[PDB]
Design a protein around this ligand. Structure first.
Ligand SMILES: O=C(O)CNC(=O)C(=O)O
Ligand SMILES: [Mg+2]
Ligand code: NI
Ligand SMILES: [Zn+2]
Length: 331
């Protein structure tokens, strides 16, 4: 069995290997990359996402989200308070202000220490989940707006034609902006490209051990767990590495820098934080190996998780027994 300790693997494809996206994902899996839940892909030196980022300041962040924490430093939830619209240039200036800017630090480890010590005492503003793309249309390799769609994959594997679309999302971050512990919708893959700015630190639980994280989460968030049998779908709970280690939960960590891709694999729980002003692009995708994960994915039916249009068909076809309850949660 390849990668039996479930380490995060880092790949350096050549420009030739960068042509065929599906083939390279399958390659990475042949080497055991999926066992970690997360892999890093460093693009060949010849590749670029676009020519420059000099002209992005007029993108609008219609609903910036202030991420307000409750709990203790290592075990907390966050809720998202909506803020007034602002442009990317206005948000960058805000991220760089004395109130929000990254503190002086020695290295990524010192910054990570400071994040876990101090995150809860601040409320950073995240421009998350913005439909759009920063890939140039002429970028033909690993262009996250030109991937094969999940609907087409389901149709190719299973023969059933379904409605829905699959487009990327932009994320504008600042120091301490946080992504809570989650797997993707329908336990899909994700791919995330850090276009510019400061790094993003990731934490991940191997898919084979995801239920250990869920059991810890039920213990640590007992009211939330009574409310919903899949409350991590709400994407609000944080647990620090120190707490994970104290509870024996297997995990790994890595820091993504600008110019690098990360892939999350089906049922790979992940969480993390931004180091400072940055911009990432991410999209969900599927492969043949995903189908079995999609069929088994948990679902929130309490009403909190509220998701895209396109998830309807995935539930309806892959999980017909759960469909009626899940759809009630949506309505
Ligand atoms: O970058 C973020 O805030 C969150 N991204 C992801 O969870 C992902 O790419 O799967
Ligand atoms: Mg612009
Ligand atoms: Ni994710
Ligand atoms: Zn729920």
């Amino acid at each position: 069995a390849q990668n039996p300790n479930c380490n995060i693997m880092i790949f350096h494809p050549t420009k030739e290997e960068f042509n065929d996206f599906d083939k390279y994902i399958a390659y990475m899996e042949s080497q055991g990359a999926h066992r970690a839940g997360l892999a890093k892909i460093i693009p060949p030196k010849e590749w670029k996402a676009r020519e420059t980022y000099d002209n992005i300041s007029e993108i609008l962040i219609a609903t910036p989200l202030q991420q307000v924490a409750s709990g203790r430093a290592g075990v907390f939830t966050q809720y998202h308070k909506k803020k007034k619209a602002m442009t990317v240039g206005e948000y960058r200036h805000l991220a760089n202000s004395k109130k929000y800017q990254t503190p002086p630090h020695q290295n990524f480890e010192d910054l990570e220490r400071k994040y876990w010590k101090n995150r809860i005492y601040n409320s950073p503003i995240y421009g998350a989940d913005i439909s759009g793309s920063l890939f140039d249309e002429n970028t033909k390799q690993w262009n996250l707006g030109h991937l094969g769609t999940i609907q087409d994959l389901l149709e190719k594997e299973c023969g059933v034609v379904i409605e829905g679309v699959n487009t990327p999302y932009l994320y504008f971050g600042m120091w301490k902006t946080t992504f809570a512990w989650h797997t993707e919708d329908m336990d899909l893959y994700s791919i995330n490209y850090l276009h510019l700015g400061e790094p993003k630190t990731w934490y991940v639980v191997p898919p084979e051990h995801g239920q250990r994280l869920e059991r810890l989460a039920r213990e640590l968030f007992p009211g939330s767990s009574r409310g919903c049998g899949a409350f991590l779908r709400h994407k609000v709970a944080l647990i620090s590495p120190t707490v994970l280690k104290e509870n024996g939960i297997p995990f790994n960590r890595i820091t993504q820098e600008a110019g690098e891709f990360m892939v999350t694999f089906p049922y790979g729980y992940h969480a993390g934080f931004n180091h400072g002003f940055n911009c990432a692009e991410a999209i969900n995708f599927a492969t043949p190996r995903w189908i079995d994960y999609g069929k088994m994915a948990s679902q929130c039916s309490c009403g909190e998780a509220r998701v895209t249009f396109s998830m309807d068909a995935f539930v309806r076809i892959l999980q017909p027994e759960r469909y009626d309850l899940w759809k009630r949660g949506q309505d």
